[PDB]
């Protein structure tokens, strides 16, 4: 049993807002992983990645339910 | 010079539209009602007609037509001498009281 | 913080109402998912009848649970089958027991949960479908879980619902998103039972306001017709 | 107002009414201390500090 | 202060009509709309700018608060 | 002119005027309730516990 | 004189029924 | 034989009040709000009675009793939300009435103006006190903050907060005393409103022009009853729109949560009609100075009759004063918005600056503008 | 009036609310009582008009 | 508190715990009693001296 949400989320992944958000998230990922002890936590650009993705999803998903 | 600013303010005031002279717009304090009582018959009758017409106009929210607005140079300070006399008498009484 | 999106709920319309079949399914979700940890004491099985269940179904549902109440002739607290009079069962006897049971955190009362959080259902839904993996650089203490929507970015609740977490009585798939939607709309119904009535409350009034306003105003203008047409003339000697 | 109260006869009235108003103020202060049972003042006065 | 001795007035002639003989809405849109535009033009220049500066300061405060919540590259 | 005869027969007297209001209130409440309710379930068809109770 | 005053025309306001100077108002009074 | 309308004592009073009372013809809608307030008073009081018929003031039952009213009581949710949004609409009408009084020089009726200030004080106290009654998280926590503000008063002040609380902090005694005072106060408001109407009826209302309208006065009953009926109907339109479509619009959702004194809410804020003076309180750093500024922000209305210096009572013919008044209105909106927001950058500086500008406009800009106004008109 | 059932929780609350509201109505009615009394004066023990000894 | 489960306990708390609460409680009760005494005496006066002609 696959979910409507996962496929809607995957289709919402490939829009340009989420593309730039994913690039910024990956940059922070490599930055924080490389540095041993830094309080810089990739929460905020993760939040923008969400804010793009969940809005894109909420515009479409309820029709699939 | 300042008279241009004065004319602009008279145009932007509003009571010229309502067909009111300047002295029709002054707040009625004790000095003012005494001066109004002191007015001659003709001036008082014209004043009350003007005020009543203005109140009618603002009740209907219709400004009086353009051409017969109270012009700046046609504005007469009829109340001013009586108000000045009233203020002078009041000031004299207060000086005597002191 | 990251707030909730603006999901197009079926009841979000100005004069729309909740889907009662989804209310019933969400209530099933509440029974068989979170009724073991969360309490909804402010609602009773009586509220269920007439909006999501019939009288016989409500009676059977009530007797399926056991409630301890009343002192007997010997004074002991005896347990009897639940009835329509009883409110929803409380999974934990006292709140301190609940906190000590889970992690010290208290599962909030689900009766008013939707009307208490800024965002409404769109918040709670976003939380339930928002269970994510902690990002790089954020540590996780073993026992907590990461949810972007929860203030504090760390929730003390394990992922409640997922795929095939239940079996709906009707037969609709029990996938995670559908379960979240149904339980969220059921929680909206529980928080604001008058919702449907309120909408029916409004519509009539709106049509009523389409009828009294143009009349009374007209009457006013009618009664003003004397003054607005009044004409004056000055005739000094 | 400001100037109309600034006259010789007005200061004459002020001088005339200073005693009555000033000791009305003492009346009010004594009444306040009495009503509130102000221990800060009532302690010093004799025969009443015994109430504490 | 009641009808009968409110004030003194002379040589004033006033007319009106019964509410049952004249229209309650005499050209409600023919002169009503031009009147509305006239009053709006009269009051707009002195009403709007205080509200528009509030609009700008509200937007600036909100955006600056959001920016402050963002991390400042450190 | 229907309004003329209507006024002359049932509006001139205040007593018959009040009878008109009181009697017409019955049927206005009737019709308005029915029309507004019908509109309400027309907008929300299938989502109330009135179009699905037959299923249960 | 008192005979030199006349009621200003209200034709901009009169209802359509009572608008002509040659119909008694009693006929349309009931309708209005 | 004499008219029962103007010979029977009660009927004579009613006749001279709002049947045959002369009124200005050019009264705009801005005066209708007055009657609206009275309506918004009665529509409140009656509803309150019904709420008081299913409310049990106690820290173990207050929230439960309110919930029982909302769900179980036949048409109880409508009464509850009617009450809340009616208080909100009452404050809307009160603010609009105060704005009208400022704009058209209505404060020249000094006695009516002072009685109105007293009524406004009593209404703020009643609403602040009433918001405690549901005993939500926001209710209790806001009450703690507001009452603890009185600790800043020198000497006696601390004891006062112990006196008002009925103990060491806001507890059941505070809740029940707040309930009792919330019951009694609206009738004091009714008596004060009767006195306010008496003072106004002595001199008569003021037309938008500001000139005396004694020459053109119309009877109150034939006209200014149905107009007030239309105004009250419009007010009801708005109020039932709020109640029936967005019930918890202005109210904070955090109220729908049992008052737990073990958890401070994310942001403690009062009602939208309280956020402006609370933001003024926030602006001043000193605690005692904060309370002084808070009380002065409303008490400054009494100074308005003295600060008037322009020869024209109203503002229709003072465009500069109109711009200043609208600047003041925008400043109050800014105060409300700032009070809503937390005390962070840049909200601190914006709130401070708007707080200074409030008093600066009321005390300085308006009188100086009035002097320039008189000078610009040869007088 | 009695809340159905018996004299129970609802009855106590509504009785308290009415008990609170009513005395203010009593105050208003007492003001009206004096207002009606004043223009007639008062009835002296003898029952005769006392307009010559007020 | 007007709740039925705690009204009597609230009254006992008034009479037992509040500072000078018993004074207020018994003053209230006996003041109601005196109000009725004075009301009966007032009605007796009105009926007697013919004041009911007002
Ligand atoms: C929160 C507040 C709640 C309460 C709000 C209402 C309180 C007062 C209600 C009673 C009242 O003041 O009635 C008179 C008041 C103003 O006078 P009026 O009844 O229009 O009579 C003609 C005017 O004097 C002058 O009319 P005019 O020459 O401008 O032409 C007609 C019309 C403009 O002509 C139009 O066609 C309107 C624009 C379309 O003017 C209007 O003001 C129309 C307003 C309604 C649309 O009535 C209204 O404003 C209508 C009801 C309120 C509508 C919303 C206003 C904002
Ligand atoms: C379309 C563009 C204009 C939108 C309205 C704003 C505007 O320029 O209003 C000009 C004007 C108000 O300014 P004004 O004529 O210089 O002063 C009229 C007085 O305030 C006396 O006004 P009034 O009581 O005779 O009737 C208007 C009054 C009536 O207000 C109320 O009844 C209370 C509710 C509004 C507060 O509402 C307003 O003045 C509020 C205007 C903005 C909201 C609409 O209103 C109109 O021409 C029509 C208002 C109703 C439109 C529907
Ligand atoms: C106001 C000054 C008089 C009242 C006062 O401060 O204390 C009076 C009396 C006696 O006070 P006291 O002398 O025991 O202590 C004074 C210091 N405080 C007030 C902080 C306890 O106290 C009261 O009446 C209670 C304090 C509030 C009064 C209002
Ligand atoms: C709280 C404050 C009010 C808030 C709401 C405000 C809006 C609604 C109320 C006011 C609406 C407008 C006025 C309605 C009443 C009215 O028309 O009064 C004038 C009208 C008179 O208007 P009229 O003078 O145009 O018509 C009558 C004159 N003849 C007879 C020649 C036609 O009053 C009446 O008609 C009274 C009739 C008798 C009493 C009522 C009878 C019906 C009762 C029905 C209920 C069951 C019993
Ligand atoms: C904004 C405009 C509308 C406001 C609300 C109108 C409600 C209904 C008013 C009414 O009864 O009539 C309105 C209009 C004109 O009515 P009136 O000016 O009285 O003239 C009647 C004779 N032609 O007459 C009509 O609309 C037709 C009546 C038949
Ligand atoms: C309200 C928005 C509409 C508005 O204000 O329109 C302008 C209108 C003009 O009024 P008027 O006296 O005709 O102006 C003549 C100018 N030559 O009206 C005005 O300029 C006066 C409006 C203000 C006076 C009445 C109060 C209304 C509520 C205003 C907000 C109050 C907020 C709290 C303030 C304390
Ligand atoms: C016990 C009640 C009476 C107490 C006072 C003593 C008494 O009996 O007073 C009688 C008194 C007679 O005096 P008077 O009314 O002036 O008539 C004189 C006729 N030669 O007359 C009165 O005192 C009449 C008083 C009537 C109202 C009070 C008594 C009734 C109260 C309950 C009703
Ligand atoms: C076995 C335990 C358990 C299950 C199952 C569970 N929860 Fe929770 N929940 C918790 C605990 C513990 C917290 C406290 C976390 C905070 O802090 C919590 C928190 C919450 C909150 C508070 C979030 C907020 O701040 O508004 C909501 C809403 C909630 N749960 C709803 C649900 C719903 C809906 C379900 C299932 C359909 C569910 N929970 C399943 C234990 C559980
Ligand atoms: C001056 C008019 C009044 C105002 C402004 C006012 C204000 C308020 C407010 C703001 C609340 C809180 C609403 C909420 O829960 O969100 C409230 C609650 C309450 N008021 Fe009033 N009130 C008024 C008159 C009255 C009167 C006269 C009574 C008594 C008859 C009363 C009894 C209550 C009760 C019992 C509550 C608690 C129920 C509740 O909170 O919903 N009110 N009041
Ligand atoms: C309890 C709420 C209040 C009620 C019921 C009330 C009642 C009224 C009413 C019915 C009027 C006549 C209509 C009008 O002019 O608007 C009026 C006038 C007035 N009120 Fe109020 N009022 C209240 C609050 C206030 C407040 C807060 C003030 C300001 C401090 C105030 C000051 C005035 C003034 C100055 C007038 C005269 C306005 C004029 O003549 O143009 N009132 N009041
Ligand atoms: C709420 C309780 C009442 C209050 C506060 C009240 C108040 C007063 C007051 C102060 C007087 C003038 C003093 C006097 O003549 O006795 C008076 C006179 C009067 N009251 Fe009352 N009254 C009350 C109840 C009643 C009752 C129950 C009646 C009888 C039905 C009544 C009928 C009268 C009459 C007839 C007078 C005229 C007495 C006279 O002048 O001889 N009152 N009332």
Automatic annotation (TrEMBL), chain A:
Listed GO biological process terms: mitochondrial electron transport, ubiquinol to cytochrome c
Keyword Ribosomal protein: no
GO terms under cellular component: mitochondrial inner membrane; respiratory chain complex
Keywords, comma-separated and alphabetical: Acetylation, Disulfide bond, Electron transport, Membrane, Mitochondrion, Mitochondrion inner membrane, Respiratory chain, Transit peptide, Transport
Localization terms from the record: Mitochondrion inner membrane
Disulfide bonding pattern of the chain: 12-18, 12-56, 28-42
Segments forming domain Ubiquinol-cytochrome C reductase hinge: 3-65
Residue stretches in coiled coil: none
Membrane topology value: Peripheral membrane protein
Function: Component of the ubiquinol-cytochrome c oxidoreductase, a multisubunit transmembrane complex that is part of the mitochondrial electron transport chain which drives oxidative phosphorylation.
Family according to the record: Belongs to the UQCRH/QCR6 family.
Entry protein name: Cytochrome b-c1 complex subunit 6
The organism of origin for this protein: Sus scrofa (Pig)
Name of encoding gene: UQCRH
Entire-sequence positions represented here: 26 to 90 of 91
UniProtKB/TrEMBL annotation, chain E:
InterPro entries documented for this protein: Cyt_bc1_su8, Cyt_bc1_su8_sf
Membrane topology type: Single-pass membrane protein
Keyword tRNA-binding among UniProt keywords: no
Key words, A-Z: Electron transport, Membrane, Mitochondrion, Mitochondrion inner membrane, Respiratory chain, Transmembrane, Transmembrane helix, Transport
A GO BP annotation: thalamus development
Entry GO CC: mitochondrial inner membrane; respiratory chain complex III
Transmembrane segment boundaries: 43-61
Subcellular location: Mitochondrion inner membrane
Main location (coarse class): mitochondrion
Record text on subunit structure and interactions: Component of the ubiquinol-cytochrome c oxidoreductase (cytochrome b-c1 complex, complex III, CIII), a multisubunit enzyme composed of 11 subunits. The complex is composed of 3 respiratory subunits cytochrome b, cytochrome c1 and Rieske protein UQCRFS1, 2 core protein subunits UQCRC1/QCR1 and UQCRC2/QCR2, and 6 low-molecular weight protein subunits UQCRH/QCR6, UQCRB/QCR7, UQCRQ/QCR8, UQCR10/QCR9, UQCR11/QCR10 and subunit 9, the cleavage product of Rieske protein UQCRFS1.
Sequence similarity: Belongs to the UQCRQ/QCR8 family.
Function: Component of the ubiquinol-cytochrome c oxidoreductase, a multisubunit transmembrane complex that is part of the mitochondrial electron transport chain which drives oxidative phosphorylation. The complex plays an important role in the uptake of multiple carbon sources present in different host niches.
Protein name: Cytochrome b-c1 complex subunit 8
Protein source organism: Sus scrofa (Pig)
From TrEMBL, chain F:
Quaternary organization: Component of the ubiquinol-cytochrome c oxidoreductase (cytochrome b-c1 complex, complex III, CIII), a multisubunit enzyme composed of 11 subunits. The complex is composed of 3 respiratory subunits cytochrome b, cytochrome c1 and Rieske protein UQCRFS1, 2 core protein subunits UQCRC1/QCR1 and UQCRC2/QCR2, and 6 low-molecular weight protein subunits UQCRH/QCR6, UQCRB/QCR7, UQCRQ/QCR8, UQCR10/QCR9, UQCR11/QCR10 and subunit 9, the cleavage product of Rieske protein UQCRFS1. Component of the ubiquinol-cytochrome c oxidoreductase (cytochrome b-c1 complex, complex III, CIII), a multisubunit enzyme composed of 3 respiratory subunits cytochrome b, cytochrome c1 and Rieske protein, 2 core protein subunits, and additional low-molecular weight protein subunits.
Job description of the protein: Component of the ubiquinol-cytochrome c oxidoreductase, a multisubunit transmembrane complex that is part of the mitochondrial electron transport chain which drives oxidative phosphorylation. The complex plays an important role in the uptake of multiple carbon sources present in different host niches.
The keyword Nucleotide-binding appears for this protein: no
SUPFAM superfamilies documented for this protein: Subunit X (non-heme 7 kDa protein) of cytochrome bc1 complex (Ubiquinol-cytochrome c reductase)
Record carries keyword Membrane: yes
Compartment list: Mitochondrion inner membrane
Single Gene Ontology BP annotation: mitochondrial electron transport, ubiquinol to cytochrome c
Automatic annotation (TrEMBL), chain I:
Binding annotation for heme b 3: 19
Binding site for heme b 2: 43
Compartments reported by the entry: Mitochondrion inner membrane
Amino-acid positions noted as binding heme b 4 in the UniProt annotation, renumbered to this chain: 19
Binding site for heme b b566: 33
Positions of a ubiquinone binding: 38
UniProt binding sites for heme b b562: 19
Residues reported in the UniProt entry to bind ubiquinone-10: 38
Binding site for heme b 1: 33, 42-43
Regions crossing the membrane: 15-37
Summary of subunit composition and partner proteins: The cytochrome bc1 complex contains 11 subunits: 3 respiratory subunits (MT-CYB, CYC1 and UQCRFS1), 2 core proteins (UQCRC1 and UQCRC2) and 6 low-molecular weight proteins (UQCRH/QCR6, UQCRB/QCR7, UQCRQ/QCR8, UQCR10/QCR9, UQCR11/QCR10 and a cleavage product of UQCRFS1). This cytochrome bc1 complex then forms a dimer.
Summary of the function given for this chain in its UniProt record: Component of the ubiquinol-cytochrome c reductase complex (complex III or cytochrome b-c1 complex) that is part of the mitochondrial respiratory chain. The b-c1 complex mediates electron transfer from ubiquinol to cytochrome c. Contributes to the generation of a proton gradient across the mitochondrial membrane that is then used for ATP synthesis.
Family per similarity comment: Belongs to the cytochrome b family.
Protein name: Cytochrome b
Native source species: Sus scrofa
Lineage, highest ranks first: Eukaryota, Metazoa, Chordata, Craniata, Vertebrata
Gene: cytb
């Amino acid at each position: 049993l696959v979910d409507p949400l996962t496929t809607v989320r995957e289709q919402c992944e490939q829009i340009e807002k989420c593309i730039k958000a994913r690039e910024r998230l990956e940059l922070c990922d490599q930055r924080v992983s490389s540095r041993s002890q830094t309080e810089e936590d990739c929460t905020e650009e993760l939040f923008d990645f969400l804010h793009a993705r969940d809005h894109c999803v909420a515009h479409k998903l309820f029709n699939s339910l | 010079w300042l008279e241009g600013i004065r004319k602009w303010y008279y145009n932007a005031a509003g009571f010229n539209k309502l067909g009111l002279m300047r002295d029709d717009t002054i707040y009625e304090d004790d000095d003012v009602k005494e001066a109004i009582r002191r007015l001659p018959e003709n001036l008082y009758n014209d004043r009350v007609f003007r005020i009543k017409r203005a109140l009618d106009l603002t009740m209907r929210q219709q400004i009086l037509p353009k051409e017969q607005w109270t012009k700046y140079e046609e504005d007469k300070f009829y109340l001013e001498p009586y108000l000045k006399e009233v203020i002078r008498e009041r000031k004299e009484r207060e000086e005597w009281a002191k | 913080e990251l707030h909730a999106p603006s999901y197009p709920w079926s009841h979000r319309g100005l004069l729309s109402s909740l889907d009662h079949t989804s209310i019933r399914r969400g209530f099933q979700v509440y029974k068989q998912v979170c009724s073991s940890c969360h309490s909804m004491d402010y609602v009773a099985y009586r509220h269920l009848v007439g909006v999501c269940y019939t009288e016989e179904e409500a009676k059977a549902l009530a007797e399926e649970v056991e409630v301890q109440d009343g002192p007997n002739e010997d004074g002991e607290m005896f347990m009897r089958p639940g009835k329509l009079s009883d409110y929803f069962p409380k999974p934990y006897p006292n709140p301190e027991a609940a906190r000590a049971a889970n992690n010290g955190a208290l599962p909030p009362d689900l009766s008013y949960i939707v009307r208490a959080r800024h965002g409404g259902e769109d918040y709670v839904f976003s939380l339930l479908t928002g269970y994510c993996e902690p990002p790089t650089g954020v540590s996780l203490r073993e026992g907590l879980y990461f949810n972007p929507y929860f203030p504090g970015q760390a929730i003390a609740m394990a992922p409640p619902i997922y795929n095939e977490v239940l079996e709906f009585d009707d037969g609709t798939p029990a996938t995670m998103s559908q379960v979240a939607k149904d339980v969220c709309t059921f929680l909206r119904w529980a928080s604001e039972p008058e919702h449907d009535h309120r909408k029916r409350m409004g519509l009539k009034m709106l049509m009523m306001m389409g009828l009294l306003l143009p009349l009374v105003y007209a009457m006013k203008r009618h009664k003003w017709s004397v003054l607005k047409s009044r004409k004056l003339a000055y005739r000094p000697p | 107002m400001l100037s109309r109260f600034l006259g010789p006869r007005y200061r004459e009235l002020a001088r005339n009414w200073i005693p009555t108003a000033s000791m009305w103020g003492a009346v009010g202060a004594v009444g306040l201390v009495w009503a509130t049972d102000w221990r800060l003042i009532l302690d010093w006065v004799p025969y009443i500090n015994g109430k504490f | 202060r009641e009808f009968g001795h409110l004030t003194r007035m002379r040589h004033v002639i006033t007319y009106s009509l019964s509410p049952f003989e004249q229209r309650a809405f005499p050209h409600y849109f023919t002169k009503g709309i031009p009147n509305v535009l006239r009053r709006t033009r009269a009051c707009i220049l002195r009403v709007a700018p205080p509200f528009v500066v509030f609009y700008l300061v509200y937007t600036w405060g909100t955006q600056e608060f959001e920016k402050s919540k963002r991390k400042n590259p450190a | 002119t229907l309004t003329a005869r209507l006024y002359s027969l049932l509006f001139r007297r205040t007593s018959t005027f009040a009878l008109t209001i009181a009697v017409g209130a019955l049927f206005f409440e009737r019709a308005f309730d029915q029309g507004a309710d019908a509109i309400y379930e027309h907008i929300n068809q299938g989502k109330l516990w009135k179009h699905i109770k037959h299923k249960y | 004189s008192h005979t030199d005053i006349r009621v200003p025309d209200f034709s901009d306001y009169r209802r359509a029924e009572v608008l002509d100077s040659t119909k008694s108002s009693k006929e349309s009074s009931d309708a209005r | 034989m004499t008219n029962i309308r103007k010979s029977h004592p009660l009927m004579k009073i009613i006749n001279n009040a709002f049947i045959d009372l002369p009124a200005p013809s050019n009264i705009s809608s801005w005066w209708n709000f007055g009657s609206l307030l009275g309506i918004c008073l009665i529509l409140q009081i009656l509803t309150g009675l019904f709420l008081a018929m299913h409310y049990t003031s106690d820290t173990t039952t207050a929230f439960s009793s309110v919930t029982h009213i909302c769900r179980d009581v036949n048409y109880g949710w409508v009464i509850r939300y009617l009450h809340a949004n009616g208080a909100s609409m009452f404050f809307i009408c009160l603010f609009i009435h105060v704005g009208r009084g400022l704009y058209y020089g209505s404060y020249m009726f000094l006695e009516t103006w002072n009685i109105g200030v007293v009524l406004l004080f009593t209404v703020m106290a009643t609403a602040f006190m009433g918001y405690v009654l549901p005993w939500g998280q926001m209710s209790f926590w806001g009450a703690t903050v507001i009452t603890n503000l009185l600790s800043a008063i020198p000497y006696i002040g601390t004891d006062l907060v112990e006196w008002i609380w009925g103990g060491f902090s806001v507890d059941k005694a505070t809740l029940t005393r707040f309930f009792a005072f919330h019951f009694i106060l609206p009738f004091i408001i009714t008596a004060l409103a009767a006195v306010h109407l008496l003072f106004l009826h002595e001199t008569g209302s003021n037309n938008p022009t500001g000139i005396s309208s004694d020459m053109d006065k119309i009877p109150f009953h034939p006209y200014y009853t149905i107009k007030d009926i239309l105004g009250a109907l419009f007010m009801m339109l708005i109020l039932l729109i709020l109640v029936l479509f967005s019930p918890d619009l202005l109210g904070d959702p955090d109220n729908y949560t049992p008052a737990n004194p073990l958890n401070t809410p994310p942001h403690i804020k009062p009602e939208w009609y309280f956020l402006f003076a609370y933001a003024i309180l926030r602006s001043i750093p000193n605690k005692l100075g904060g309370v002084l500024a808070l009380v002065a922000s409303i008490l400054i209305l009494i100074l308005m009759p003295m600060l008037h210096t322009s020869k024209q009572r109203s503002m229709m013919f003072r465009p500069l004063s109109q711009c200043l008044f609208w600047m003041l209105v925008a400043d109050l909106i800014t105060l409300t918005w700032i009070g809503g927001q937390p005390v962070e950058h840049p909200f601190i500086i914006i709130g401070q600056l708007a707080s200074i500008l409030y008093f600066l406009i009321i005390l300085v800009l308006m009188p100086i503008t009035s002097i320039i106004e008189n000078n610009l008109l040869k007088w």
